[PDB]
């Protein structure tokens, strides 16, 4: 899913 | 776009509980990840937090990661302080894939009462002036935490260039002693009236200021 | 476990070039993006940029973009800082750390290097100019400015009531330091202060006597 360096919870 | 801000200096006895604070500006700080690193005095930096609240192996469980989504900010709290503690703290995050640091704060693991510090500016030589040079000194002494924002003035415009502080170092007391100098030309010397050195220690600001 | 190991110290002349490296080792080069922090003498960590040792993208800082080079080598799991043309401006502790998952799993903790010192001096021996700090209570503090030589060691000594002696500053790769002494209001100016400023790399001593304006 998420595809961008540190950009998660 | 994003920023972390930072308080400079934090402090507490041995025993004591103390919490470093790094607030997240232009971007909410649940979007992203944050990661605290611990510098000592001489050695090279580690992680001591990763992921919000995570600790690598053999940091202890007293070191502990929070985030808080109403004032936008994460905490390192660090309870039972001892000496090892005494460091340069940094957070970390993440916008658009770049790394974003604090400033750092220094934990001071206090040893000895807290010390303002004695502040004398002094003006430029007319030795010195005759070189086309003009070199104020702002002098600091005897202040613990060893931790000092200076700011220049002149004539009420805040100097952003031509400024530079020494790190603290220690006296014989292990007290901190510091110097700022502001270098100019001559020709800026005679433009402007009225010079301030102003030194912020513990949140409270004393200003040495002169005439030409 | 997990090891960044570093080049040693570069101690170079301005204008010169230098590429620090950076061997990992104990996971996959790949999964972790490493990360470029520099510095300068008693200043913060500054973040330079990063390389996605993944899809080969490199990102620079604003203020780094230029005369900073990132690369890597896949094949030896190894990192490049190239520096171009240095400046003494560039003087610093220059850290190897790694980054965060270039794909879908955590464990992404910040290990970092011993870091690599990049000195970047003319090394030329320089006496230093010597100027007199006199003021514009019961005490008076007059002082010494020490400003723009080479190399560290110079010593300050005072005759007239305790002295304070600053650390030296480093700026264009000349030292500049400052020396206070505190006596009694009384004993100046109606008493000679002068101060003694060795310089043993030059061979130089100057005494200055501090007049009053
Ligand atoms: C080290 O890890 C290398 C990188 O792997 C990827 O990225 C990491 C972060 C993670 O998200 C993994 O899921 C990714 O695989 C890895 O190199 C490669 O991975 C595969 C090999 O299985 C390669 O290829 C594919 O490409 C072919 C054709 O090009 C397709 O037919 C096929 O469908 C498949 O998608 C990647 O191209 C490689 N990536 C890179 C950057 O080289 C490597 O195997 C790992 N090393 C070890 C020793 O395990
Ligand atoms: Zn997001
Ligand atoms: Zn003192
Ligand atoms: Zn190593
Ligand atoms: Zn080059």
């Known amino acids: 899913l998420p595809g961008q360096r540190g950009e998660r919870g | 776009n994003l920023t972390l801000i930072q308080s400079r200096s934090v402090s507490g006895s041995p025993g004591q509980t103390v919490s470093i604070s790094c607030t997240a500006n232009g971007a909410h700080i649940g979007d992203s990840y944050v990661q605290w690193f611990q510098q000592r005095p001489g050695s090279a930096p580690r992680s001591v937090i990763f992921e919000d609240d995570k600790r690598p192996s053999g940091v202890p469980d007293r070191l502990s990661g929070s985030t808080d989504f109403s004032s936008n900010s994460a905490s390192l709290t660090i309870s039972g302080l001892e000496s090892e503690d005494e460091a340069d703290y940094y957070c970390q995050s993440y916008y658009r894939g770049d790394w974003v640091l604090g400033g750092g704060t220094k934990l001071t693991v206090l040893g000895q009462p807290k010390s303002s510090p004695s502040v004398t500016l002094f003006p430029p030589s007319s030795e010195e002036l005759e070189t086309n040079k003009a070199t104020l000194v702002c002098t600091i002494t005897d202040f613990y935490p060893g931790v000092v924002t200076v700011d220049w003035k002149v004539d009420g415009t805040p100097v952003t260039q031509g400024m530079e502080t020494t790190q603290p170092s220690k006296q014989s007391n292990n007290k901190y002693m510091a110097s700022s100098y502001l270098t100019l030309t001559a020709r800026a010397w005679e433009r402007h009236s009225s010079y301030s050195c102003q030194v912020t220690h513990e949140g409270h600001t004393v200003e040495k200021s002169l005439s030409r | 476990q997990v090891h960044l190991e570093q080049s040693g110290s570069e101690l170079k002349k301005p204008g010169a070039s230098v590429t620090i490296s950076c061997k990992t080792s104990?996971?996959?080069?790949?999964?972790?993006?490493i990360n470029w922090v520099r510095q300068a003498p008693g200043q913060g960590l500054q973040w330079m940029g990063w390389i996605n040792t993944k899809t080969a993208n490199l990102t620079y800082a604003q203020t780094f973009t230029g005369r900073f080079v990132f690369s890597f080598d896949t094949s030896v799991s190894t990192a490049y800082l190239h520096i171009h043309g240095l400046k003494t401006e560039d003087t610093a502790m220059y850290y190897c750390?790694?980054?965060?998952?270039?794909?879908?799993?955590?464990?992404?903790?910040?290990?970092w290097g011993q870091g690599a010192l990049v000195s970047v001096s003319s090394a030329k021996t320089t006496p230093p100019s010597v100027y007199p700090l006199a003021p514009g209570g019961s005490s008076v503090t007059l002082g010494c400015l020490v400003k723009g030589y080479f190399p560290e060691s110079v010593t300050v000594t005072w005759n007239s009531s305790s002295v304070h002696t600053f650390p030296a500053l480093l700026q264009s790769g000349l030292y500049t330091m400052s020396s206070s002494v505190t006596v009694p209001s009384s004993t100046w100016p109606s008493q000679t202060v002068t101060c003694s400023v060795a310089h043993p790399a030059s061979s130089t001593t100057v005494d200055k006597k501090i007049e009053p304006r």
């Open positions: 104990g996971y996959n080069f790949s999964h972790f993006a």
């Open positions: 750390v790694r980054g965060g998952s270039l794909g879908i799993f955590g464990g992404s903790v910040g290990y």
